Design a protein around this nucleic acid. Structure first.
Length: 178
DNA sequence: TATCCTAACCAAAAGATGATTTGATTGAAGGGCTTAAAATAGGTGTGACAGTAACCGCTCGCTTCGGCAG
């Protein structure tokens, strides 16, 4: 059963279609929050604290936002940037909101001997202590990629909802225990 | 006496004994990484493609140019 520690989400990734053409130079000229460094990259990157997130905008009318701790928080930040662009003088719309990725982490509070895991799980676990200190495991159900360390803490990514993170956590937990 | 020993002590070499100063070490932090994922947005150089390109031991047959012929 559960060890009493829940996987806390660390990140959320989401995108929405603004539905109109925008001028990045105009945004950099008007908005009190903007980049335009075309010498490096022709784009504008936002960020707000409530929710704590970073978003990025193009002239093509797409938005990519990331940084929240919950999917609904990410959507709130997305709608905040949509409001900002609407009051920037652009006819922005909050259309086709899609959630792309999230990151979570947890712990088991006992040491992990990676050698046994690689010896019994090499077919899906990649161990290489020379470059990346931890161990890499790719999980199929659901499409999750997992990082495991000796300290017992685990990083989970590749899901679309917190339920997937929890379910993968409890799938791996017996393996971590033994 | 002329000179010395070497107990107990004075002047100097050396031989040693602990406290202090300087050469040397490092503990922790500035720092600046890692793959792992997911994503739109992009610029061009370049590196395949493909083509011509260039450079790099014994015994017979066949032939000629004079010495008499015509």
């Amino acid at each position: 059963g559960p060890s009493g520690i829940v996987p806390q989400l660390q990140n959320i990734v989401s995108t929405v279609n603004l539905g109109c053409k925008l001028d990045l130079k105009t945004i950099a000229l008007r908005a009190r929050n903007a980049e335009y460094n075309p010498k490096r990259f022709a784009a504008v990157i936002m960020r707000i604290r409530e929710p704590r997130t970073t978003a990025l905008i193009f002239s093509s009318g797409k938005m990519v936002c990331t940084g929240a701790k919950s999917e609904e928080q990410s959507r709130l930040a997305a709608r905040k940037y949509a409001r900002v662009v609407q009051k920037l003088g652009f006819p922005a719309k909050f259309l086709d909101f899609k959630i792309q990725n999230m990151v979570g982490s947890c712990d088991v509070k006992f040491p992990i001997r990676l050698e046994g895991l690689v010896l019994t799980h090499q077919q899906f676990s990649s161990y290489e202590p020379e470059l990346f200190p931890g161990l890499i495991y790719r999980m199929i159900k659901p499409r999750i990629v997992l990082l495991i360390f000796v300290s017992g803490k685990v990083v989970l990514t590749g899901a679309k909802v917190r339920a997937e993170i929890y379910e993968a956590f409890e799938n791996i937990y017996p393996i971590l225990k033994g």
